[PDB]
Amino acid sequence: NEVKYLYLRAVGGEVGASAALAPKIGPLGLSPKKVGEDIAKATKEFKGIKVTVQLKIQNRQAAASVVPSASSLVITALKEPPRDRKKDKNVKHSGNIQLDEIIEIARQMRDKSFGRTLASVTKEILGTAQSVGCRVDFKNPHDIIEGINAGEIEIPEN
Amino acid sequence: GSGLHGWAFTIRQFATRYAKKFGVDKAKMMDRLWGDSFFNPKTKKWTNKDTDAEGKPLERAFNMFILDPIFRLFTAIMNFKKDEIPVLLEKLEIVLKGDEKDLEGKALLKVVMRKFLPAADALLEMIVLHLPSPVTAQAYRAEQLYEGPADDANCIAIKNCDPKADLMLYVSKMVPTSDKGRFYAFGRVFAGTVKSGQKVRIQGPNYVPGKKDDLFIKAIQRVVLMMGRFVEPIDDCPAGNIIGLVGIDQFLLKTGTLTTSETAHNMKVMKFSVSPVVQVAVEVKNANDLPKLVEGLKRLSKSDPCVLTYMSESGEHIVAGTGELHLEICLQDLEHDHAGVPLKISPPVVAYRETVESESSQTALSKSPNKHNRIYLKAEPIDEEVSLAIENGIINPRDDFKARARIMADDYGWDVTDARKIWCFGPDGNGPNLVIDQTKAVQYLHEIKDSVVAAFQWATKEGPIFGEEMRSVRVNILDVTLGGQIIPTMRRATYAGFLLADPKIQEPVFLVEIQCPEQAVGGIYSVLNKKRGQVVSEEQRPGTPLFTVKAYLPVNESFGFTGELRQATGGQAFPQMVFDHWSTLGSDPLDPTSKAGEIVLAARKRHGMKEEVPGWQEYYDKL
Amino acid sequence: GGIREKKAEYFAKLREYLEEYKSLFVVGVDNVSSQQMHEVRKELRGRAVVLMGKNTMVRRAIRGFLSDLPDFEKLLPFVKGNVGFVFTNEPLTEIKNVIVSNRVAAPARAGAVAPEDIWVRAVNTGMEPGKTSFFQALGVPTKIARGTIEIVSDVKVVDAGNKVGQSEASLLNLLNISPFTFGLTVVQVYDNGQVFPSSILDI
RNA sequence: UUCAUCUAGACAGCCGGACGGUGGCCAUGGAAGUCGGAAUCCGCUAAGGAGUGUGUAACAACUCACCGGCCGAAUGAACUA
């Protein structure tokens, strides 16, 4: 009755490769197939994204719980078409996300982030969205960060 | 123990002598000998603690009752303590006799401790105590000693180890003796009794019980006993034993199953995971003495279970072995015993494959030497997969052009009017280069086709760059203006089309499966990074740290890949070389600085042809 | 001049914190990690403010501030070592309780004075049986069961106040046991012109 | 010679923090600060560079820039002849 937590990163929206799933799961004796479709069912809407999945392994069953990351939540803010790895090589994520969406994913990320305020956590999310390349209301995430820093963009603390 | 001084010992025999002086039995003795074992000599009390209530460390029981006799006898007789030799002798109940009293030093150690601990009692006692008998061994081992239906009657006979059941043997190796070539069949009688003159079915590895391939219902001349080097005939031999026999030699190749029942299948014809990887080109120094080389190659293939003799595509005799050790020993045996002729060893010269990747820039024109007929064509590369299909036989040159065109167009994406109008394939009547007709205004499309096919066969068996075969070239005949006149025209026309379609060379590419540990993957990745190794992928099983890499590797670096890889990684890695496919190269044959130019120039200096790479200028017919 | 500006703003921050907040905690931050500081501030968000810097600028600000506030002269002989301050106005008992509650264990190091008793329990290691030589060298009884190492009993390795050595520290690293704990240690408390230690707080 | 750091205490030395989004955008047979191109962003303080090197199949791990504790008068860089 030893609950073990296994952090694995598989491609969302697809069944994970059995060779990649083998070394961390095989000594624990679970079926690589079954943990594959469990991770796929947990990550249906994360299609084309390397997403961290925590496997709660306890008594020969593994529960696949998605650990939400900033890049994954920003791409599932973009709602871009699913990533085809083979053909295009330098996809610049040029979709537009809005401030209410960055507020709502900050509210989702409130349980793990170490920022004091929602403004600071949204600044972190804007930095991650800048690392991805996303434009926020047709404006630069940088410029929006200094807007909130100067206080021109008031963020509701609820 | 040690075989050099001829001795062995076990705590089981030390228990056999310690039982009477301590009152405790064998198993519990050795339980207080291995592990956390300690004994207290101040109160005579065995305990699981290195120290006591007072706390000075004690020493282990394995060190006080066993290694302490060994240590003190070493110290006394190496440092010449004759005041300590006889008292230790009588304490350890050794007895000396005569000269063995008179010995001193290393030979004294030899004799007194050969009298103390012979190797026989120990090594013999383990191999009979714990090491398995054939009944239990086959009772859990019956399903890999037979590849097929595991519920068969012969298999339950194997699992029960019946001496008078259906006779099956497995000739495992074709063992060499001093019979001037004629060997003996070293094999194990798992079931049945082999007799001198018994009609037994010789089954080859390719044999299946529903066919006739490599199956010989033949009698045995003689059955012989094996004791390492001598030869001794035996009448009969029962199940579970390994015996030699002669008479199977002229019918069986290398290894083979030997059954008496038609229902019984073959067994596992080895697994190796070693494979013949390193390859050398053998030829003669005497063409008159070449028959002895061919007989010697056949005999060497019979002799060593992992040697492989086969012909190349360029004609040399490729001998394939596992390593440089194994090749050099097989070659010395072949040169001195199997053939008896001085040979020559060479690198395995590779057949390369000339291939264009472009459409021809300008129209390919050639004319008859009598100047009556002209030919206009183009040359274009063919897709890799569809050429593989042609070479695999989906696209077979003997079918009806209609249904071929249907498959070619619907699955592979071609122009179907052409695909019905397909003319021919080369080389060898089955190759992937094909000639296609586009001409619509030519009246006589019947008196040219046979000459077209014939000298396309000639061009594709001898292309224009360095006189070697072609691949994945489609020849669009666009126009002809109308065998002594047509054959040179299409020779020059295919030549001009190739050289105007910008040729390159395909080099062969191996797929290698390397079994390796996760602490030697770094060395293997370093070796593949030395030599252009595009590893396809990365597999393993989870229970073991053994880890397989499937990889693409070229041949000009595979010449010496095996030694370099094992030098860098130790003997940790094991390769499985099988030929994958043909891959393209990215250099121009006309440029001698590049790889393609170097390899074509090396081929021209090897074959003694003209030095330059000929082109569309002198393979063109202008006004 | 940027260094001059940041230390001027540090002096201004110390002035406003000293005037705003009535009670002070002088805390040692010996061997405490930056992330642990982040969760200390997360637990003290909107509660009490943590300020630290170099004790030389602290001392210079205090003896420049002695003109109007002379009780920080009593606070002067205690700014020694890795010292931070937390400014507060709510009671010192649960200020100390939160500060000593936020603790994170750290792996043992070779030659290090053990603060508490180090015990290795009869817990299944999950390691291959090649480390039984190390276990027998350190005296821990282990048995190879189901193909893995099992610790038979509970063994004390290092006594309290003794130096953890190299083999014991390597065994703790291999077993992923972290007996060394590191956290903020309240060494002095200032309230209403008086200085008195956390022992008097614990009274 | 020029510029910078300096009793609001530097330079060196000893001790130990050297975090997070992050296996950052890609590229991946494989690249987590350290094969490669482009971004070189702040959350918070004492600070942490999408990382200065060693290392790994990639990880792990070691060590720097930066930073704090002891410390008590000058030294750090680039040039010139």
Short mmCIF file of N, CA and C in Angstrom, two decimals, chain A residues 30-100:
data_model
loop_
_atom_site.label_atom_id
_atom_site.label_comp_id
_atom_site.label_asym_id
_atom_site.label_seq_id
_atom_site.Cartn_x
_atom_site.Cartn_y
_atom_site.Cartn_z
N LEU A 30 3.45 -2.58 -14.55
CA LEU A 30 2.19 -2.19 -15.17
C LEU A 30 2.27 -2.38 -16.68
N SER A 31 1.11 -2.46 -17.31
CA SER A 31 1.08 -2.65 -18.75
C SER A 31 1.37 -1.33 -19.45
N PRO A 32 2.42 -1.26 -20.28
CA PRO A 32 2.71 -0.01 -21.00
C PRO A 32 1.60 0.43 -21.92
N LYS A 33 0.88 -0.53 -22.51
CA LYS A 33 -0.30 -0.19 -23.28
C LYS A 33 -1.30 0.57 -22.42
N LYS A 34 -1.71 -0.01 -21.28
CA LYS A 34 -2.82 0.56 -20.50
C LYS A 34 -2.45 1.92 -19.93
N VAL A 35 -1.20 2.10 -19.50
CA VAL A 35 -0.82 3.44 -19.06
C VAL A 35 -0.75 4.39 -20.25
N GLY A 36 -0.47 3.87 -21.46
CA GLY A 36 -0.54 4.68 -22.66
C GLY A 36 -1.92 5.24 -22.97
N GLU A 37 -2.96 4.39 -22.99
CA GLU A 37 -4.27 4.98 -23.28
C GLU A 37 -4.80 5.78 -22.09
N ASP A 38 -4.36 5.47 -20.87
CA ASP A 38 -4.78 6.31 -19.75
C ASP A 38 -4.20 7.72 -19.87
N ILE A 39 -2.92 7.83 -20.23
CA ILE A 39 -2.32 9.14 -20.45
C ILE A 39 -2.96 9.84 -21.65
N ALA A 40 -3.29 9.07 -22.70
CA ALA A 40 -3.96 9.65 -23.86
C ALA A 40 -5.34 10.20 -23.51
N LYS A 41 -6.12 9.46 -22.71
CA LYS A 41 -7.43 9.93 -22.29
C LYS A 41 -7.32 11.16 -21.39
N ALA A 42 -6.30 11.19 -20.53
CA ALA A 42 -6.08 12.38 -19.71
C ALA A 42 -5.62 13.57 -20.54
N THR A 43 -4.95 13.33 -21.67
CA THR A 43 -4.38 14.39 -22.49
C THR A 43 -4.97 14.42 -23.91
N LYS A 44 -6.27 14.17 -24.04
CA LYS A 44 -6.93 14.32 -25.34
C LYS A 44 -6.84 15.75 -25.87
N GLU A 45 -7.08 16.74 -25.01
CA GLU A 45 -7.10 18.13 -25.47
C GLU A 45 -5.71 18.76 -25.45
N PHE A 46 -4.69 18.02 -25.05
CA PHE A 46 -3.30 18.47 -25.10
C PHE A 46 -2.58 17.94 -26.33
N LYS A 47 -3.28 17.86 -27.47
CA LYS A 47 -2.74 17.19 -28.64
C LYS A 47 -1.54 17.94 -29.22
N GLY A 48 -0.43 17.22 -29.36
CA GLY A 48 0.79 17.78 -29.90
C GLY A 48 1.68 18.49 -28.90
N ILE A 49 1.41 18.37 -27.60
CA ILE A 49 2.15 19.08 -26.56
C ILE A 49 2.77 18.06 -25.62
N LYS A 50 4.06 18.24 -25.31
CA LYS A 50 4.71 17.46 -24.27
C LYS A 50 4.21 17.94 -22.91
N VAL A 51 3.39 17.12 -22.25
CA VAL A 51 2.67 17.53 -21.05
C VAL A 51 3.05 16.60 -19.91
N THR A 52 3.37 17.18 -18.75
CA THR A 52 3.72 16.40 -17.58
C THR A 52 2.49 15.70 -17.00
N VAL A 53 2.59 14.39 -16.84
CA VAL A 53 1.53 13.56 -16.28
C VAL A 53 2.11 12.86 -15.06
N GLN A 54 1.45 13.01 -13.92
CA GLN A 54 1.80 12.31 -12.70
C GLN A 54 0.98 11.03 -12.63
N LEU A 55 1.67 9.90 -12.58
CA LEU A 55 1.03 8.61 -12.40
C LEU A 55 1.00 8.28 -10.92
N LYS A 56 -0.21 8.22 -10.36
CA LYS A 56 -0.42 7.70 -9.01
C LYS A 56 -0.49 6.18 -9.14
N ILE A 57 0.59 5.50 -8.78
CA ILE A 57 0.67 4.05 -8.88
C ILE A 57 0.49 3.47 -7.49
N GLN A 58 -0.49 2.59 -7.35
CA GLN A 58 -0.87 2.02 -6.06
C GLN A 58 -1.66 0.75 -6.33
N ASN A 59 -1.13 -0.39 -5.87
CA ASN A 59 -1.78 -1.70 -5.98
C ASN A 59 -2.09 -2.07 -7.43
N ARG A 60 -1.05 -2.05 -8.26
CA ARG A 60 -1.07 -2.51 -9.65
C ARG A 60 -2.04 -1.75 -10.55
N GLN A 61 -2.39 -0.51 -10.19
CA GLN A 61 -3.11 0.37 -11.08
C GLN A 61 -2.46 1.75 -11.06
N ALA A 62 -2.48 2.43 -12.20
CA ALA A 62 -1.89 3.75 -12.34
C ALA A 62 -2.96 4.73 -12.78
N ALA A 63 -3.17 5.77 -11.97
CA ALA A 63 -4.08 6.85 -12.31
C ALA A 63 -3.27 7.99 -12.91
N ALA A 64 -3.58 8.36 -14.15
CA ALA A 64 -2.85 9.40 -14.86
C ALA A 64 -3.53 10.74 -14.60
N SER A 65 -2.89 11.59 -13.81
CA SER A 65 -3.39 12.93 -13.52
C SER A 65 -2.47 13.95 -14.17
N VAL A 66 -3.05 14.83 -14.98
CA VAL A 66 -2.27 15.83 -15.70
C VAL A 66 -1.82 16.90 -14.73
N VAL A 67 -0.52 17.20 -14.71
CA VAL A 67 0.01 18.35 -13.99
C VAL A 67 0.04 19.52 -14.98
N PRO A 68 -0.80 20.54 -14.80
CA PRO A 68 -0.88 21.61 -15.81
C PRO A 68 0.35 22.50 -15.78
N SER A 69 0.91 22.76 -16.96
CA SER A 69 2.06 23.63 -17.13
C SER A 69 1.64 24.90 -17.86
N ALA A 70 2.49 25.92 -17.73
CA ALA A 70 2.18 27.23 -18.30
C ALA A 70 2.14 27.18 -19.82
N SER A 71 3.11 26.50 -20.45
CA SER A 71 3.14 26.41 -21.90
C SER A 71 1.95 25.63 -22.44
N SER A 72 1.58 24.53 -21.77
CA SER A 72 0.43 23.75 -22.19
C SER A 72 -0.86 24.55 -22.06
N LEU A 73 -1.02 25.28 -20.95
CA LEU A 73 -2.22 26.09 -20.77
C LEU A 73 -2.25 27.27 -21.74
N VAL A 74 -1.09 27.78 -22.13
CA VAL A 74 -1.06 28.88 -23.10
C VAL A 74 -1.40 28.38 -24.50
N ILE A 75 -0.94 27.18 -24.87
CA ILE A 75 -1.31 26.63 -26.17
C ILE A 75 -2.80 26.27 -26.19
N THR A 76 -3.31 25.71 -25.09
CA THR A 76 -4.74 25.47 -24.98
C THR A 76 -5.51 26.74 -24.63
N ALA A 77 -4.83 27.88 -24.56
CA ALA A 77 -5.49 29.17 -24.70
C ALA A 77 -5.55 29.59 -26.16
N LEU A 78 -4.48 29.31 -26.91
CA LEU A 78 -4.42 29.67 -28.32
C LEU A 78 -5.46 28.93 -29.15
N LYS A 79 -5.71 27.65 -28.85
CA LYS A 79 -6.57 26.78 -29.67
C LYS A 79 -6.11 26.74 -31.12
N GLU A 80 -4.79 26.64 -31.30
CA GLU A 80 -4.21 26.47 -32.62
C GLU A 80 -4.51 25.06 -33.13
N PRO A 81 -4.40 24.83 -34.44
CA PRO A 81 -4.56 23.48 -34.97
C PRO A 81 -3.52 22.54 -34.39
N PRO A 82 -3.84 21.25 -34.26
CA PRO A 82 -2.91 20.31 -33.62
C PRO A 82 -1.59 20.19 -34.38
N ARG A 83 -0.52 20.04 -33.62
CA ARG A 83 0.83 20.15 -34.16
C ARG A 83 1.17 18.92 -34.98
N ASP A 84 1.57 19.13 -36.23
CA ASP A 84 2.11 18.08 -37.08
C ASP A 84 3.63 18.20 -37.02
N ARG A 85 4.27 17.24 -36.36
CA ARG A 85 5.70 17.29 -36.09
C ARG A 85 6.55 17.09 -37.34
N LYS A 86 6.03 16.44 -38.38
CA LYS A 86 6.86 15.97 -39.47
C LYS A 86 7.10 17.01 -40.56
N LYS A 87 6.15 17.90 -40.83
CA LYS A 87 6.20 18.71 -42.05
C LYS A 87 6.78 20.10 -41.79
N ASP A 88 6.18 20.87 -40.89
CA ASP A 88 6.60 22.23 -40.62
C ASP A 88 7.53 22.22 -39.41
N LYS A 89 8.52 23.11 -39.43
CA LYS A 89 9.66 23.03 -38.52
C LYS A 89 9.77 24.22 -37.58
N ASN A 90 9.24 25.38 -37.96
CA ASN A 90 9.45 26.63 -37.23
C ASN A 90 8.13 27.36 -37.04
N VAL A 91 7.13 26.65 -36.52
CA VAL A 91 5.81 27.22 -36.25
C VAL A 91 5.96 28.34 -35.22
N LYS A 92 5.73 29.58 -35.65
CA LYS A 92 5.64 30.69 -34.71
C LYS A 92 4.19 30.80 -34.25
N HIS A 93 3.97 30.63 -32.96
CA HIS A 93 2.62 30.68 -32.40
C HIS A 93 2.14 32.12 -32.41
N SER A 94 1.43 32.50 -33.47
CA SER A 94 1.01 33.88 -33.69
C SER A 94 -0.45 34.12 -33.32
N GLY A 95 -1.08 33.18 -32.62
CA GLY A 95 -2.45 33.39 -32.20
C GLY A 95 -2.57 34.43 -31.10
N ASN A 96 -3.78 34.95 -30.94
CA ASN A 96 -4.06 36.02 -30.00
C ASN A 96 -4.84 35.48 -28.81
N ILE A 97 -4.35 35.77 -27.60
CA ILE A 97 -5.01 35.41 -26.35
C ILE A 97 -5.45 36.70 -25.66
N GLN A 98 -6.49 36.62 -24.84
CA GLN A 98 -7.03 37.82 -24.24
C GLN A 98 -6.74 37.83 -22.74
N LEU A 99 -6.83 39.03 -22.16
CA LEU A 99 -6.53 39.26 -20.76
C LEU A 99 -7.45 38.49 -19.81
N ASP A 100 -8.73 38.29 -20.15
CA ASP A 100 -9.58 37.50 -19.25
C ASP A 100 -9.11 36.06 -19.21
#
